[PDB]
Design a protein around this ligand. Structure first.
Ligand SMILES: [Ca+2]
Length: 223
């Protein structure tokens, strides 16, 4: 996260870190046994870490659970990042409490102007490299489809929205990928892509979760 603030320990209780010997992606807990992330975050050997603040220090609220199965969206296209969404099932259920909690799926899509919270352990600089140990937070609005498409001509599908600031300076970044965009208590987005980080006229692009609720719910019910 560039230009954000220190969230505070366990103030974002649905936030997960995906670990393959090191943090490599974010995710969201959507029930006791399932996590949602980006498809471009796919790898084999994933451990899910819940209850994290400092990802380098065991502080006492953590749950570390292996993934049993990963499911990349059937129509994921790694060239265009269309359908950039993946489900991860945990080997056993997490224990849910005030500090580890699931986030609700939307019943309807959010519109431009809604304010949202974006969170993660990704890079904090736009020019150069500095990875935080503690979770960072950013309040950002959803942008119009028209400003989104104007920023990235020929690149935005119906499964994508932009959020952020056209003036630059505040954005998600490398290492935030797969993490949550939550708006009015519902998961509306997944951190997906962008050109650089926090560049002017280049906002963040997010997977539009409300398009995938049917797939998520049917997939969970059958697996
Ligand atoms: Ca920790």
């Amino acid at each position: 996260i560039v230009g954000g603030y220190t969230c505070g320990a366990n103030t974002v209780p649905y936030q997960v870190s995906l670990n393959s010997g090191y943090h490599f992606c974010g995710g969201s807990l959507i029930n006791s046994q399932w996590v949602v992330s980006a498809a471009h975050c796919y790898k084999s050997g994933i451990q899910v870490r819940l209850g994290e603040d400092n990802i380098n220090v065991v502080e006492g609220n953590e749950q570390f659970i292996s993934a049993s199965k990963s499911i990349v969206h059937p129509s994921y296209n790694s060239n265009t990042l269309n359908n950039d969404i993946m489900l991860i099932k945990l080997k056993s259920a997490a224990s849910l409490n005030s500090r580890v909690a699931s986030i609700s799926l939307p019943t309807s899509c959010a519109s431009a102007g809604t304010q949202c919270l974006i969170s993660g352990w990704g890079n904090t600089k736009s020019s150069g490299t500095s990875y935080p140990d503690v979770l960072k937070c950013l309040k950002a609005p959803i942008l119009s489809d028209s400003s989104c498409k104007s920023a990235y001509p020929g690149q935005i599908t119906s499964n994508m929205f932009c959020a952020g600031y056209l003036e630059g300076g505040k954005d998600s970044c490398q290492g935030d990928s797969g993490g949550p965009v939550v708006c009015s208590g519902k998961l509306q987005g997944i951190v997906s892509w962008g050109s650089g980080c926090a560049q002017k006229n280049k906002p963040g692009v997010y997977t539009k979760v409300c398009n995938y609720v049917s797939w998520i719910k049917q997939t969970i019910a059958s697996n």
